[PDB]
């Protein structure tokens, strides 16, 4: 448990790990609102929440049943949560276009409810995601917030070293990743995340669902990994609000001009 | 310890982990010859040996004192070892050009003493290596041997996901890596190697020096990691001959055409 803000840390972040109810945005957004309040009371300045949490992780049903107007309304409620609980908020909804044109996105809003960055998931996972969404085509955004450079990726993205390297090449120091990882994929948090942190010298935070949802069983295992590859904090399979204080040469040495020809 | 060749394995490899004496190729090549004999007696078909073992890991002294003729003579002795001990052999010497033009290389010779592949280290580590050698400019080779596709990288190369991805993109299934890792860099074998295996679905074998050598202290920790990221065999800090039987979709999903623009 967090404590007084520590000497030599100036950024405290929180990660929401919980089950969502498919197709029930009232319930799911109330859950994000509750977590945002609790995170703010514990002195966190940012809350990271999981992939597609607002509608639950149900790609085919989002495609078939969730309108652009319904997506927009949840987006508006989330902006309202960041503002009314006074905390930066990173969430993940379908994009704003029609059901057959939109992707999976993540957005960061500041403690005023204003969206600072939006990113569209580039690496879609499995046939259901690829059937329900259009892959993104743009590199991850990087922006100054709270004293360092933040970036966004979504779930399967982080499993490609190229995606994390793309953020780090643009200056990212802290990469925030809404996720929905099911099926006891231990190698992702256990093996891949630590390497993505070490091999770029960066911190990543990964906020998952947990528990029965939409036919799948989510792993939980939300975690913040620092540049040495070690967890600064982590959850197991139970729902929880993880709160972590962040403390105050591969990227130069890599022969990028050769690498880009060899992929 | 190895045992009878197991049902459902058809490739047994060996990794030599030992200290080298700087500037004493008679001593060091006799050590490789001894290991090659022992590996062959244990039924291994290939022996992997460490980076710059023949002259010891002493970049500045190789540059200043070791002639192209001396390098060629060690190369000839190594070819003779592969032939006379009847075992494929992967070694690492300076390249064949003059001291100011050559790089660090790795070569694979078959059990007849014929060199099948040569590769020049692309990612040089630290100011001493960059002062003593020219970086390679070519992607890692990939070739059929013993029933699968083999490739070569050297030491620091493997710490760049781009280098391993370059081999895997050309079809590599088993990547063999002469190394010289000193200074208790646990994150390399502990964190990076398992990820390089998982994120490409490949096996890597990493053969290090161990013990006091040329001013440094080598970690040992030679290891073979399989596609799930788990060690199939490993050594600690003491000298040893590691013998491992190998048993009988990131690479498709990666959006390479976007990634190459984002590095």
Distance CA A185, CA A178 (A): 16
Total Cβ atoms within 10 A of residue B148: 17
Give A152-179 as a DSSP string.
E--GGGGGSHHHHHHHHHTT-SEEEEE-
Question: Which of A137, A198, A259 is closest, CB to CB, to B263?
Answer: A259
Distance CA A247, CA B45 (A): 50
Nearest to B21 by CA among B52, B49, B56, B50: B56
C-beta atoms of A161 and B161 within 8 A: yes
Question: Which of B169, B196, B254 is closest, CB to CB, to A262?
Answer: B169
Experimental method of this PDB entry: X-ray
Mutate to test the interface with B, among A129, A254, A256 (most CBs of B within 10 A): A254
CB A106 within 8 A of CB A94: no
CB B129 within 8 A of CB B179: no
Tokens 């990547």 -> residue? B175
Torsion region of B56: left, alpha or beta (phi above 0 gives left; psi -120 to 50 gives alpha): left
Q: Number of helices (H) and strands (E) in chain A: give both, helices first.
A: 9, 14
The count of C-alpha atoms lying within 13 angstroms of the C-alpha of A157, restricted to the half-sphere facing its C-beta, is 33
Helical H segments across chain B, by residue range: 25-41, 59-65, 68-85, 126-132, 161-169, 187, 193-200, 250-253, 256-262
CA gyration radius, chain A: 17
Mutate to test the interface with B, among A142, A187, A193, A195 (most CBs of B within 10 A): A195
C-beta atoms of A261 and B262 within 8 A: no
Q: Phi first, then psi: what are they for B37, rounded to 5°?
A: -60, -50
Cβ pairs A/B, distance under 8 A: 112
DSSP state at residue A134: P
Return the structure tokens found at A179.
Answer: 């996720």
What's the structural domain count of chain B?
1
Distance CA A96, CA A78 (A): 14
Residues of B in contact with A254 (CB under 8 A): 123, 160, 162, 263
CB A134 within 8 A of CB A103: yes
CB A59 within 8 A of CB A133: yes
Residue A252 contacts B, CB cutoff 8 Å: no
C-beta atoms of A122 and B198 within 8 A: no
Alpha-carbon distance B48 to nearest alpha carbon in chain A (angstroms): 25
Cβ-based neighbours of A85, under 8 Å, separated by 6 or more: A33, A36, A37, A39, A40
CB B104 within 8 A of CB B97: no
Mutate to test the interface with A, among B141, B157, B160, B228 (most CBs of A within 10 A): B160
Nearest to A89 by CA among A8, A145, A9: A145
Nearest to B116 by CA among B85, B138, B94, B149: B149
**CATH number of the domain encompassing residue A176:** 3.60.110.10
Nearest to B62 by CA among B143, B153, B129: B129
Distances (CA, A) of B62 to A64, B27, B120, B178, B214: 67, 16, 16, 17, 11
C-beta atoms of B191 and A229 within 8 A: yes
Q: Which residues lie across from B176 on neighbouring strands?
A: B152, B205
Torsion region of B99: left, alpha or beta (phi above 0 gives left; psi -120 to 50 gives alpha): alpha
The angle subtended at Cα B101 by Cα B100 and Cα B106, nearest 5°, is: 115
C-beta atoms of B160 and A194 within 8 A: no
Mutate to test the interface with A, among B172, B195, B261 (most CBs of A within 10 A): B195
Alpha-carbon distance A137 to nearest alpha carbon in chain B (angstroms): 7
Distance CA B4, CA A189 (A): 37
Distance CA B149, CA B159 (A): 21
Residue A249 contacts B, CB cutoff 8 Å: no
Residue B5 contacts A, CB cutoff 8 Å: no
Torsion region of B209: left, alpha or beta (phi above 0 gives left; psi -120 to 50 gives alpha): beta
The angle subtended at Cα B135 by Cα B130 and Cα B136, nearest 5°, is: 165
Tokens 């982080």 -> residue? A158
Q: In chain B, which residue's Cα lies nearest the Cα of A169?
A: B263
Alpha-carbon distance B242 to nearest alpha carbon in chain A (angstroms): 24
Distance CA A96, CA A110 (A): 20
Distance CA A77, CA A27 (A): 12
Resolution in A: 1.7
Residues of B in contact with A163 (CB under 8 A): 259
Distance CA B49, CA B19 (A): 11
Residue A129 contacts B, CB cutoff 8 Å: no
C-beta atoms of B162 and A123 within 8 A: no
CB B239 within 8 A of CB B218: no
**A216: containing domain:** 1-263
CA gyration radius, chain B: 17
C-beta atoms of A162 and B161 within 8 A: yes
CB A242 within 8 A of CB A39: no
What burial letters (b/e) apply to B188-199, b meaning 16+ CB within 10 Å? bbebbbbbbbbb
Nearest to A76 by CA among A56, A58, A91: A91
Helical H segments across chain A, by residue range: 25-41, 59-65, 68-85, 126-132, 161-169, 187, 193-200, 250-253, 256-262
């Amino acid at each position: 448990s967090s404590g007084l803000v520590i000497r030599g840390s100036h950024m405290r972040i929180a990660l929401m790990q919980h089950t969502a109810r498919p197709l029930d945005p009232q319930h799911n957004l109330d859950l994000i609102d509750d977590a945002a309040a609790r995170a703010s009371e514990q002195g966190a300045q940012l809350l990271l929440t999981p992939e597609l949490f607002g509608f639950g992780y149900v790609p085919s049903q989002i495609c078939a049943q969730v309108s652009a107007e319904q997506v927009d309304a949840a987006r508006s409620r989330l902006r309202g949560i960041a503002r009314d609980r006074g905390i930066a908020l990173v969430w993940s909804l379908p994009g704003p276009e029609g059901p057959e044109q939109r992707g999976i996105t993540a957005e960061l809003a500041d403690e005023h409810g204003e969206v600072l960055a939006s990113y569209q998931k580039v690496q879609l996972y499995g046939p259901e995601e690829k059937a329900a969404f259009v892959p993104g085509e743009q590199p991850p955004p990087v922006l100054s917030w709270g004293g360092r450079q933040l970036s966004l990726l979504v779930c399967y993205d982080v499993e490609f070293p190229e995606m994390v390297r793309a953020a780090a090449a643009r200056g990212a120091q802290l990469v925030l990743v809404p996720t929905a990882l099911a099926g006891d994929e231990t190698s992702v948090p256990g093996i891949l995340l630590p390497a993505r942190a070490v091999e770029n010298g960066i911190t990543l935070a990964y906020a998952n669902h947990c528990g029965p949802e939409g036919g799948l069983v989510f792993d939980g295992g939300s975690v913040v990994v620092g540049p040495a590859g070690q967890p600064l904090g982590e959850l197991g399979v139970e729902p929880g609000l993880l709160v972590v204080d962040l403390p105050d040469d591969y990227l130069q040495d890599r022969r990028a001009e050769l690498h880009r020809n060899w992929l």
